[PDB]
Symmetry: D2
């Protein structure tokens, strides 16, 4: 029922070699797992998010976002990343994102709590 | 079972007058609703996210994040915001966040797709 | 000749206790020194930037930005911060900024090169 | 005298087709002009910034930043962009940046004042 429900659902890979496995629900839900190739992380972590299930039809992307808290049964990096971006469908489908990675800190160190970057996900490689 | 499960769960308000209603699950889940005082928005929107259910005990905050896609039964702003931040417990509990608001755009306009800002949530006002 | 040349020029302090000393030139230039209360820093560092010397008159802020590279005669933190924001004049003048702090890294660590945050500068305290 | 003074100085192009013309001073200064291929802009605008004139030698990049206020003799977009990033030398030299573009706004619209994105500059194309 979601316009890009089928186009978003599946396995995605970014430029770092991370793997994003997502299911897009008819209603706007995103659920899945994330495995980072880098950082204080091992194996899969739960993700959840949301996407625009009725996007504009005018060649525009589909807005979406999701979160990973970096705790699983193997490790806890006391941090969470949120990706915010858009899905662009077609032969070379992509999800283009910017992210914010916040660590738990003391109040004295909160100024240095948050990393920012950008990931591009593709269906191959 | 989550360390700040009780401290996070409930109603939060930010500096804009927005209202965040969240339940924190024992496992790391965040679910709830968001109502923005500003922007292309009306009434409540679904949110989901994650938090560190076993944070450091050393005076450090609790990392968390969540997403809203700005589609509900009233409006669709073809956009999604992700907040990334930390919960700081105590008499004056706060959630301190930075956010990324991505709009669906054409590829030609993707350079101007994403707003960034910061919200502080409190339990009063 | 700059509309807020007089309002911007002078000494500013942020919420961390840092001190920003700036001169605004008629043409749009910003020059001065920055002293951070936090981080890998001591004493003053050179800053340069730019501001909108002919802003809108409609109650709107004045856009501006500036950079500090964190090298001086005392220390080198192999990093640079840029603040991007707006000057809001009046009894309680403020400069409201967001910043990006990039460290030199290897290519393998570039994903974790860049911190993001927000500073508010006032003329007192 | 700056380690990458020679490597930074010159003409750079980003993925949008914008042109960055910079001189790096021995002392850490960056001066030049920027011409954007997109947005509310025409022709060249003054830029100034700073870079780490004595970077780490260990395969690490060179931290730098610069600002453009989007006022010149042709147009005034009441905004400023700051790029924060690192120069990576070698056969395929690059400057990898993240940026913050703040517009002057009323206080009521300040939540939507600031765009964020990422530009990669190369010496060709």
């Amino acid at each position: 029922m979601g316009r890009d429900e089928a186009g978003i659902t599946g396995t995605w890979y970014n430029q770092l070699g991370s793997t994003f496995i997502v299911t897009a629900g008819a209603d706007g839900a995103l659920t899945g797992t994330y495995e980072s190739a880098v950082g204080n992380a091992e194996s899969r972590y739960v993700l959840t998010g949301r996407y625009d299930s009725a996007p504009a039809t005018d060649g525009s992307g589909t807005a979406l976002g999701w979160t990973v808290a970096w705790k699983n049964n193997y490790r806890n990096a006391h941090s969470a990343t949120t990706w915010s971006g858009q899905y662009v469908g077609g032969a070379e489908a992509r999800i283009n994102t910017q992210w914010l990675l916040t660590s738990g800190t003391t109040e004295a160190n909160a100024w240095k709590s948050t990393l920012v970057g950008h990931d591009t996900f593709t269906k191959v490689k």
